[PDB]
């Protein structure tokens, strides 16, 4: 049982860094600052980061390095009763790969479309335009970049819903193929090659962020955007919604208990200082988000100042921000083609090494549980990515966005929250902090402070519950603009979201009815960890 290991410390770090930072740092974090009181939002964000995200982040990394197995095996060895967490986690990572990678596909599509003297999303006199098109964002109107991304790139207007996916965009299917070809030839030999691909995919975003920061700040009106970005409004701290947005952002932007840090750390040396790794990577992830904020809003202020557009219409979140709003500003500045190609290549690398982690979480968790596919890695992941691609063509259809949007709001959003919730309960109460603090001490030489133990035991479950409850309160039958999803689409969504959580009692009830003795004598066998 002594497995492979990282061919260099940096390979692991850049793998965790690469996974942890993605488009969410770019397209969610700065918008929250803007929405929830600017710099004042850093206080609930920072506190939720200190007592919520980083403890959970540290926990999984320690769990990975210590037990040295993938998600399924590690949790089974930790608590036999709650082994389904491993399965719940893996198929979540499985569901996300179905829709997440198309964001990278969209990135490459814009990357190819940027090989022109004139960027095609500048004007409103193209074949794919409507009388409602205006050169930039406006209330009651559509923008040239919005109509380019919608009526040309997506051809979403030709879909009446999710029942009507329409024809297949083969220019998009090709890009999705290229995405998986990269993903294939980065993960098929394991961390020996993956730990090298992340040297580009995790470092290029910082190369791009740097010169997009310079170009962003050199622009007229840049300082105006920084005002919109970080002008403190501490009244927000008194609001419970701000804390919930902070808590939610911190959690999903660090990705703890998702089975990927677990898998990545499982290849670490046993006596590696994983505590220093947790703190270093957590900081870099949040620092990247902070820097990305300046990158985004420097251009946002430039638009509000020299392009005469309202700040309300451009300070947005999600794919609307980098596929519509930001490229719209790029096409107006000198050397537009250069900044376009680099931006889009940033967003691509920003998602790639995250997609690596998600997939690797699956492949590692399965190789440790099933030797059949550990011996045949390349064959398995080829079948895996082929499966991804085949159904991924549905995301490449005219109504492909409707498919993407459904999974996004159901596939992993709620499932992983109650999954990680059971993780915190399992290690801090079933497995106990006592035994976990002991494990960590044997590794890095010293036990966690009383701080981490309190956080793992009391703060983390409340933190996770504070988010799950919050996403439930703000629930709303799935819609997009005017379009309202049919009831069955919403029902299917809860099935996908439910097919993960149901693994928790399913195997619990299963392994219970597989045990000799009495009811009190089932829990002890299924409570006692693997180390015996």
């Amino acid at each position, epitope marked *: 049982d002594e497995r492979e290991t990282w061919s260099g410390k940096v390979d692991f770090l850049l793998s965790v860094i690469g996974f942890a930072v993605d488009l969410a740092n770019v397209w969610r974090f700065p918008y929250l600052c803007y929405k929830n009181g600017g710099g004042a939002f850093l206080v609930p964000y920072g506190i939720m980061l200190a007592v919520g995200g980083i403890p959970l982040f540290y926990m999984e990394l320690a769990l990975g390095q210590h037990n040295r197995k993938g998600a399924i095996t590690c949790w089974g060895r930790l608590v036999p009763l709650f082994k389904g967490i491993g399965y719940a986690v893996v198929l979540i990572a499985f569901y996300v790969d179905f829709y997440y990678n198309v964001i990278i596909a969209w990135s490459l599509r814009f990357f190819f479309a940027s090989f022109t003297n004139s960027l095609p999303w500048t004007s409103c006199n193209n074949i794919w335009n409507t009388p409602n098109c205006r050169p930039f964002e406006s209330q009651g109107f559509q923008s040239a970049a919005s109509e380019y991304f919608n009526r040309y790139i997506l051809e979403l207007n030709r879909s009446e819903g999710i029942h009507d996916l329409g024809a297949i965009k083969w220019d998009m299917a090709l890009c999705l193929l290229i995405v998986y070809l990269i993903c294939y030839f980065s993960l098929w030999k394991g961390i020996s090659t993956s730990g090298k691909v992340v040297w580009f995919t995790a470092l290029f975003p910082y190369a791009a962020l740097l010169i997009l920061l310079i170009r962003g700040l050199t622009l007229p009106g840049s300082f105006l955007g920084i005002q919109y970005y970080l002008t403190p409004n501490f009244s927000a701290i008194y609001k419970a919604e701000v804390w919930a947005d902070a808590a939610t952002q911190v959690f999903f932007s660090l990705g703890p208990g998702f089975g990927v840090l677990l898998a990545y750390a499982s290849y670490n040396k046993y006596h590696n200082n994983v505590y220093k790794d947790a703190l270093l990577t957590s900081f870099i992830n949040s620092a990247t988000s902070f820097i990305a904020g300046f990158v985004i809003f420097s251009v946002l202020g430039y638009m509000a100042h020299t392009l005469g557009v309202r700040i309300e219409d451009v300070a947005t979140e999600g794919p609307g921000l980098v596929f519509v709003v930001y490229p719209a500003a790029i096409a107006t500045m000198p050397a537009s083609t250069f900044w376009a190609l680099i931006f889009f290549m940033m967003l691509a690398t920003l998602g790639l090494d995250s997609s690596f982690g998600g997939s690797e979480a699956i492949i590692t968790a399965l190789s440790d549980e099933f030797p059949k596919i550990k011996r045949n890695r390349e064959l398995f992941v080829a079948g895996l990515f082929s499966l991804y691609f085949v159904v991924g063509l549905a995301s490449c259809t005219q109504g492909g966005f409707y498919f993407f949007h459904l999974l996004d709001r159901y596939a992993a959003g709620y499932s992983i929250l109650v999954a990680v919730f059971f993780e915190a309960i399992a290690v801090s109460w079933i497995y106990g902090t006592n035994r976990f603090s002991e494990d960590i001490r*044997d590794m890095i030489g010293f036990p966690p402070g009383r701080y981490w133990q309190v956080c793992w035991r009391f703060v983390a479950p409340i933190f996770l519950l504070f988010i799950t409850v919050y996403l439930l309160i703000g629930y709303e039958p799935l819609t997009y603009a005017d379009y309202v999803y049919p009831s069955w689409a919403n029902a299917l969504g809860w099935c996908i979201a439910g097919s993960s959580v149901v693994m928790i009692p399913a195997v619990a009830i299963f392994k219970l009815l597989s045990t000799p003795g009495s009811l009190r004598q089932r829990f002890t066998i299924l409570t006692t960890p693997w180390r015996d």
Partner: antibody, heavy 119, light 109 residues
Framework: EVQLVESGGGLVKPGGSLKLSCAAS????????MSWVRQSPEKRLEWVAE????????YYSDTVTGRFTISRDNARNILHLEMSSLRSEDTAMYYC????????????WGQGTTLTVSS | ENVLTQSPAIMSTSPGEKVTMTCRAS???????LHWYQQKSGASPKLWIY???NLASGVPARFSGSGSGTSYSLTISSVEAEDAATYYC?????????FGSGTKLEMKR
């Protein structure tokens, strides 16, 4: 406040068997890893065995391994060291010592207890 | 095992003198894993200097340590008469844990 007292020890013929103990008081004993360190006649220090805070991690020295066994009682706060197949090289002042943190070493030592192995 | 060798074995010192005893390892030791102990006659050892730089509590400022890899040392700025003891270096880098041969401080007259 912190106090460690070793008991047992004494004269033992080669091949003999004895169980050393250490009573701890003044701290959460279940929260710290204990070690046995023995001193030569010559007043040289030699580490014998380490046991973790929950006893789930055990380490022995090459001279000691296979013969001695370090134990724990977190209920009564007692550290134990059973010795068997005793040799004349095991003659030493055996110290109850505790360090949780590798980085800080053994911050507390017991008064010790003398074991003599001779024919 | 990683055997630690201390020199000198015996050191004659008058109070007020600056002295430096060395601890040499056969294998590389992490700076945060080498420690120093003082042992008075007829007493149990006390943690003196942990991680080769940090004095334990009660330890006078006159004591200090330095070193890295396979060469460390305990240095006293100004020896006092109450320093007449034996000083042991110990590594907790790898198992088995090993102590140094020891350095004994004796006074002059």
């Amino acid at each position: 406040e912190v106090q460690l007292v070793e008991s047992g020890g004494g004269l033992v013929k080669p091949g003999g068997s004895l169980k050393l103990s250490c009573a701890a008081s003044g701290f959460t004993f279940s929260s710290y890893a204990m070690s046995w360190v023995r001193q030569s006649p010559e007043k040289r220090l030699e580490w014998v065995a380490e046991i973790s805070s929950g006893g789930r991690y055990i380490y022995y020295s090459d001279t000691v391994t296979g013969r001695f066994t370090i134990s724990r009682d977190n209920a009564r706060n007692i550290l134990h060291l059973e010795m068997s197949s005793l040799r004349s090289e095991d003659t030493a002042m055996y110290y109850c010592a505790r360090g949780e943190v590798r980085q800080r070493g053994f911050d507390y030592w017991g008064q010790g207890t003398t074991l003599t192995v001779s024919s | 095992e990683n055997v630690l060798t201390q020199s000198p074995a015996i050191m004659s010192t008058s109070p007020g003198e600056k002295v430096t005893m060395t601890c040499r390892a056969s294998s590389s030791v992490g700076s945060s894993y080498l420690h120093w102990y003082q042992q008075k006659s007829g007493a149990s050892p006390k943690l003196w200097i942990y991680s080769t730089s940090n004095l334990a509590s009660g330890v006078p400022a006159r004591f200090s340590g330095s070193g890295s890899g396979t060469s460390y040392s305990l240095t006293i700025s100004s020896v006092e008469a109450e320093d007449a003891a034996t000083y042991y270096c110990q590594q907790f880098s790898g198992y088995p844990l090993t102590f140094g041969s020891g350095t004994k401080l004796e006074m002059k007259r």
